[PDB]
Write a protein that binds this ligand. Structure first.
Ligand code: U5P
Ligand code: U5P
Lengths: 229, 229
């Protein structure tokens, strides 16, 4: 499947009120920094007990030793996917990949964030980066692949280029998904679900356009219908 | 006080075995990606119940909206200090500080990571960064100060420069503290505790040189005495 719904609530009951209205065939679920800081690993158990596979989206970005132990702790949790920041460096990503060797085929997918979907060219200029978001993401994606990771988090606007330069096997997870007529918010490098599918995206992450609608389950089912067709 | 001890255990009992042997007057405690991924916020509450102030070291690095809500979750947790990645950009750091406005003076200190103490020049060159770690950290620190944050995490090797360029009020938290004779590991920009004190650091983070000691409490007290005298 392709759809991943971001559970970005500030309340455990509110999140579970939505999850109890949907089915694991509808999507996988993403647990991010907000809900994990409030609830910790028990929330991952809450979703597993309900039959969902979980993308643990904590974007580990630390020294190699710390990043490796954090990724191993995520693997002990049994999640479907976990990610790191590619701008954490090659030694960091390699330590992360080696930390998953003890878990064999049960290890989670190991993804690296390239350039966050909220960052535009002016955002990177404050950091001294002169490359466009696409070019910098491309550089970070190639480094991630060369370090042996399974794929990258990127904007859907980079999918066609990444699939062609890095191959079909390298997995692309794209947030910054916005249907026609939904507020962009802090997102910048965006694409409709239909546009992201055409680009070759493997997994599309959607949050606020689903979780903040008058009927989140129907919105999610409506998007899935548009892509399955 | 200044000393902060990194709790980097893979088992809750092992960490509490050390914590039960020390007193809040000896140090504050740092909870990182590993222990938080294994135990979640309840572990921080356990430390508060024992009278310790906690530096929640999760290095939030995400889109502005997510980072702000994660920072708010940490403030709801009541921590003394919480950090973000300065390379997440100005909008993200600003969103994080604005997220703490509802908590008034009870807000945690908001710190930004510049260049990780494990990163040397060759590590940054894989990211297209041509500046030295000191120069690039200085650029990220300046952006952090202009975004209204309370300070940065940096190497102690940058303290004398940073205190002069960024001022006394901007707080410097430095890991990479290695008493002479002890292995550096994956740390690259390191200073002894006595050296970091002379440089003007506000808070020094020490991990493995205490926790892997056959007597961590006695080792910590010995370091504190060397800095006292
Ligand atoms: O480049 C990235 C990496 C991660 N996320 C995460 O993906 C989700 C997107 O949700 P939304 O912007 O659709 O509400 C959020 O959890 C956000 O933190 C992004 O938006 N962009
Ligand atoms: O630039 C940074 C920021 C944070 N830490 C954290 O500080 C601690 C350093 O402990 P140690 O390397 O002394 O064992 C670890 O928890 C690590 O994640 C660093 O080492 N360097």
């Amino acid at each position: 499947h392709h759809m991943v719904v971001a559970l970005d609530y500030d309340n455990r009951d509110k999140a579970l009120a939505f999850v109890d209205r949907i089915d694991p065939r509808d999507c996988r679920l993403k647990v991010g920094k907000e809900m994990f800081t409030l609830l910790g690993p028990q929330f991952v158990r809450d979703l597993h007990q309900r039959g969902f596979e979980v993308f643990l989206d904590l974007k580990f970005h630390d020294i190699p030793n710390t990043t490796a132990r954090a990724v191993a702790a995520a693997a002990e949790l049994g999640v479907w996917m976990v990610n790191v920041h590619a701008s954490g460096g090659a030694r960091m990503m390699t330590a992360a990949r080696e930390a998953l060797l003890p878990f064999g085929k049960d290890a989670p997918l190991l993804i690296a964030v390239t350039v966050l979907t909220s960052m535009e060219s002016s955002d990177l200029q404050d950091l001294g980066i002169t490359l466009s978001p696409a070019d910098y993401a491309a550089k970070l994606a190639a480094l991630t692949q060369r370090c042996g990771l399974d794929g990258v988090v990127c904007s859907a606007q980079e999918a066609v280029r990444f699939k062609h330069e890095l191959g079909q096997a390298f997995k692309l997870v794209t947030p910054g998904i916005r249907p026609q007529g939904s507020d962009a918010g802090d997102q910048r490098r965006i694409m409709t679900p239909e546009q992201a599918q055409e680009a070759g995206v493997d997994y599309m992450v959607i949050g606020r356009p689903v979780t903040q609608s008058a009927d989140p389950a129907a919105t999610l089912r409506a998007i899935n219908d548009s892509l399955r067709k």
